[PDB]
Symmetry: T
Subunit: 157 residues, 12 copies
């Protein structure tokens, strides 16, 4: 009954986003979880290096959901609703080192930027504005992965 | 090992808090979920009434996790970790009026302020400082429930 | 004599933005007009929900013109210049309730996001950067229409 | 012993203001009283709508009292001193809806902009500066009545 | 049905302002129009010189319209409503030098400080508060004309 | 019909805060009254030493009521409501020196911190969170009385 | 050649202000002079009490001079131009106590609020806007005299 | 002669605090000393991780002393006065690694949170407000120890 | 190894960007060089017109380097590294008028917006996110060139 | 009776700063005088290029006096006190173009940086800290003269 | 090893500074000690007069320690470390009037500005940059002593 | 034709600064280059530890050039113009560890503080103000080297 223009084409994208909407929600809790379980002789560096990224992604969440409802469908943001769309195993790492946790996080982001890049191409035709949302997000998500990656590498590790 | 003092008495409280860090995490997600599914001829009021409360509880999330780690134990923040501690059904309400959602939230807070209150008496003897945390939280959580409650009462609604 | 690259292809987009430029100017006035004429028991919510949107679009305006002028052409922002490009009737709603004004506004935006979407596609070949401007604008304009829409619905009203 | 110019004229304006300093102090308490007793599906709108106005009037309080001492006389700020100058009944309205409290407030303001206007003309030939003080307040106070009025009215309600 | 005091007198001042609300809205668009059409070896000076003045006048707009609704009448903000009250020709001047546009602006302001002054005296015996509003604006508007004038003149040019 | 937990035990604390609520309101006025009546060669120090304290207590006020309303009861903040609970004479000191007003204030606070201490203990069983409110308030109120006391002593004056 | 309205009337008000622009510039220097020459067991109170007032008056300076150029005439800001308009002796008082300097300042202000008031009435029938300027200043200047006066006085001293 | 209520009971707590008052003073210098002698390939992390804690504890100092004087006794804050109450050996570590310095600091905090927790229980009866001071402090002191601890540990080291 | 996805397609873009990070670095230095060699009776205008643009491009510098590292490759930022990628002659103009320098800069931007534009088409297929970067940049770079261009044009200068 | 070290050697520097003190005061007025008398098509650039400089020097003033008073002597800041030390003619330039006023100002500064340089060397033995004051001041004063100079030259005008 | 240049000449200065870092540390503690033991009918004046000076000297503390470490040597900041370098008796004065305390502080500064001055001449040849540090400090330290001195002087007190 | 005073003596210093002006320019790019190529398990620490230093030195650049032009000569800031004055080999280190890069950077600063200290002594006679510029800079440059150095050392490494 209400999107910006295309009854169907939108419902497609509305579900594309909801998949992202839930990945971020796992993401920011996951990030946060990592932040307070990270440990060892660089913990404050990373612990904090994270906090912007939490705050950023959390917002990415808002931007998705607000978009979805803009598209017409309803966004779903309860932990129930994320296990539903989720496709990793929930971050299993616990009190652990940086290296452990970033190794761990690298792979998590790996899902996210892969999925997001895919929803980007899917969107290229359907809805460009929403393509642009994730494109923005994506730069920032990728960047953050580079931060985490740079913590463990040398020649090209 | 590490706590502030009592190898056991802490371990006891570190699960009280872990019961809580998971409740808030549910809460903040839930609030947020409510923030962007709310609707009607008062939606912006509440919508924004909420946004501080998210940001606040989310921070409540940090405070107690950071405390858990302080007590010694590791805090558990992944959405898996909150289904594990969760006691209610996850928030049932989707796109829907303010009126619905606040009834819905009212009930949610009802878990939280009761649960937190109970954890406060439990804390009175064991660890006082952790009592103080939840006491602070409690004031602000309860307050917010009165914000939400006031939305549907005259005589004594 | 001056653009960034294509004498004709620019003149084409400079005529496009100009149509937009004037739509926004109508809009920020329209918005503002609505804002100090809205009324009823939801008044302040909306009265203020608006003000950011005014300010945003007003800036959206500066971005049009400065782009036009960048493109080479001269941009036009006098009330005479806007009636010249204006393709709607001017906002007919005088003092009134919220519900009225938002229905009225919903329609106005219907014009704006429809038109903007069209100038986006018109631009996908022409000039990508100008495409980017409006894609940006678009998300935010659309978002705002959802804010107003969410004010009068439930199932899918 | 000390004013700026007219040893008598000043004393006349000095009590004029004291009547205002007391009305405001009633006002600011009254506003605050209303703000935390308001209720219903619109409470946070008004509840907050009000807050700037409290802080504003309170300041208005400062400006006149400081002005009185400037004039020469001593200003009187205690609840005893306001009951003494007061000439309404004190806000009778207790926990209650918006529409109720705003009806009530509307009337309260009615005493204020009436009395303040009256004290302005009285002041045209006493002391202009002091005239300007209240003229300033007047706009702002009047504006705030319109905010509250706008809550119940349709074509001219 | 509602003003602060005089059921008629108010309606008289109410249209006075509406004449202003429309002049300003022309003004603010006009200013903005000039700002992005100015040019030559002095453009950024003026281009910016202007910006505070736009934001200022725009605000001046708010203050009178809000004032009108305060008075009782409804204020009229659409481009249709300004062409309707307008009594100049609309800014004819298109891309062009500083000196050109400032000459043009000077004249535009000339209508404004003239008309505004006239509406002030008219107001001395209608409504003082509303008189003060424009007196305030007057200083600021007048000041801005002097800024623009100061651009071409030597001994008295 | 609504509190956080105990229908009676709340009504008991809601009557306690209410007594406090009104003490503060008297206080912020009293403070403010003192502030613009203080005088002598120490005037500005104190004149300003006060203003934070006003503002603090005023907020202390909001915290009472919002707690009361949270507790379920309706809070009462009209000057009539404060004389009703008021257990002192209203601040009798009119224009005067610092030394006078602080002696006068020292006594007023003597009432406040005495009473607050008592409602704290009354609360240690009743409602802990409300206990926490006033404990917070207390430290700051006490601190302030020391600020005023420190103004007139040496050995232990 | 250029004012806003009255080619003569304006010149009359233009010198009125120049008398003020010079009084202020004396004033602001004078204030500053006092501020760094004050002394005794109260110096930092006043020393600072003053600082806002300098910055304020200095600004008052700007407002009238800018106003003069607005009126048409050129304003005159050099020490030569103030000795020229000046009509007191220059602050004779050198390093010295508070009470001394405030006595001295009190008198200085006395010239100011007297002269400024006189220039206001003179202005009621020349130019109202310019009248408002000084009325504004007047409150603020007058307020500052009361601050300084309040330093030595008991029952009416 | 002056506390809030209990001549003796207060003098007891007044000395309890002074012990803390001096521990913090050792603490913030000690922290600071550590901050500029820390070294190695994570120094900036910790170096900065410290700086908030200095600023925080330093304030904790103020809060103690101000409380003491509030209680009636005089607070003692000279390096003489801290050696007097001190009970560790002064931080002996010098230009040294992080690990060294945090190992070193862990143990220092160990004294502090142990002592503070003890003064907490001592206070539970005597003066609750002061109990609350340290309780607040304590959370924050403990938290900071968790930061330092987390720098050297893995499984539970 | 590391990129977001395509081992080659990235490597390709990582030199597109490296072509750019070096162009900006030249640019920001050049701008700055121009900022403090500019001169004439409009120097401050432009001088300051520039300072944002430096700070902005400099940040453009970070964004793409940080992207390069994200894509996997290492970014090269030393002045050696920019002579290596540089395609124009380094900025020829020394102390000299605005008019000269903007002609000079105009030509400089002409390299940049053309080059960046070309790199954007090149990016359309390979890596979209990196396209978006330069697209954003482009808008702002081109804009600035219009600021500079406007400094010497009427008819179509 | 009081300096930092040398009864005579201070009195010598206290007479030096005093000469400076008054030069600045003349200057800030002079600057300010220039600022609201400048004119032509470069007006706003300079009109504002100045304001920081005013404010800076004004503060330069406070630093002189406070230093003098620190040195032991009493500093002198009344317009009479500045003509007493003043070694130039007062700024003769009334309304005028930029080019004029800056030529005029260039000369004024010529006095200031010449004199300041001389009091610097005079100080290299006398009092180093006072030397430092003026060295600071100097750089900034000189810098500003270059700002004004750069306004009227090219080869080396 | 590490310094900026001279293996010895630095080592020499690194104890000059270490003499200073310990003096300031005493100072800031002492100031603070004075801030909260001050008392009388001017206590807030001075009390607050001090608080910047603490914060400032404390930072003076960092600057020179950070310099020491820069010169190569390790700085020593523990209260043990300041009794080791300390040359006066620790601050003798307990709860006591302003007048006492400033006499007391006056004497304290007297050590400091003399000592620092002497260390500045000592530095003139060896290390200039470190001279500049203490020179900066000196201005501000001496200044503060004049603030304190001014509290008890007329003729030449 | 224009410096502050000495045709030659200045041209000497003008070239002294230009050598520094270019070292910084290499410096800030070099720093920046280091910041985005730094890597390993402390990268965020240093990566950020750098960013202030970039921003700081970049400004140091401005301060030089602005000074040069103040001296009369023209400052040269193009990458061409830095290779011209440069005397290291351009930073050759590429994607590499912290330790590598700081080892690398230590030596770079080594040039800079050595050169700057030398231009300091050269300046001691010629121009003191410019001596002071670099002296300021120098403290800060040295400090930053201490930060980098402290990352690799223990006993005195």
């Amino acid at each position: 009954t209400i999107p910006g223009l295309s009854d169907k084409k939108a419902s497609d994208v509305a579900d594309l986003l909801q998949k992202q909407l839930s990945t971020y929600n796992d993401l920011h809790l996951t990030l946060k979880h990592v932040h307070w379980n990270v440990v060892g002789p660089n913990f404050i560096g990373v612990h904090e290096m994270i906090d912007p990224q939490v705050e950023l992604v959390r917002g990415y969440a808002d931007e998705v959901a607000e978009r979805i409802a803009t598209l017409g469908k309803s966004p779903k943001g309860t932990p129930g609703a994320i296990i539903k769309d989720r496709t990793w195993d929930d971050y299993s790492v616990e009190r652990d080192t940086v290296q452990a946790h970033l190794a761990a996080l690298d792979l998590v982001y790996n899902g996210v930027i892969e999925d997001t890049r895919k929803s980007i191409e899917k969107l290229e035709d359907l809805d460009l504005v929403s393509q642009d949302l994730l494109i923005a997000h994506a730069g920032e998500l990728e960047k953050f992965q580079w931060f985490v990656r740079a913590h463990l590498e040398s020649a090209g590790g």
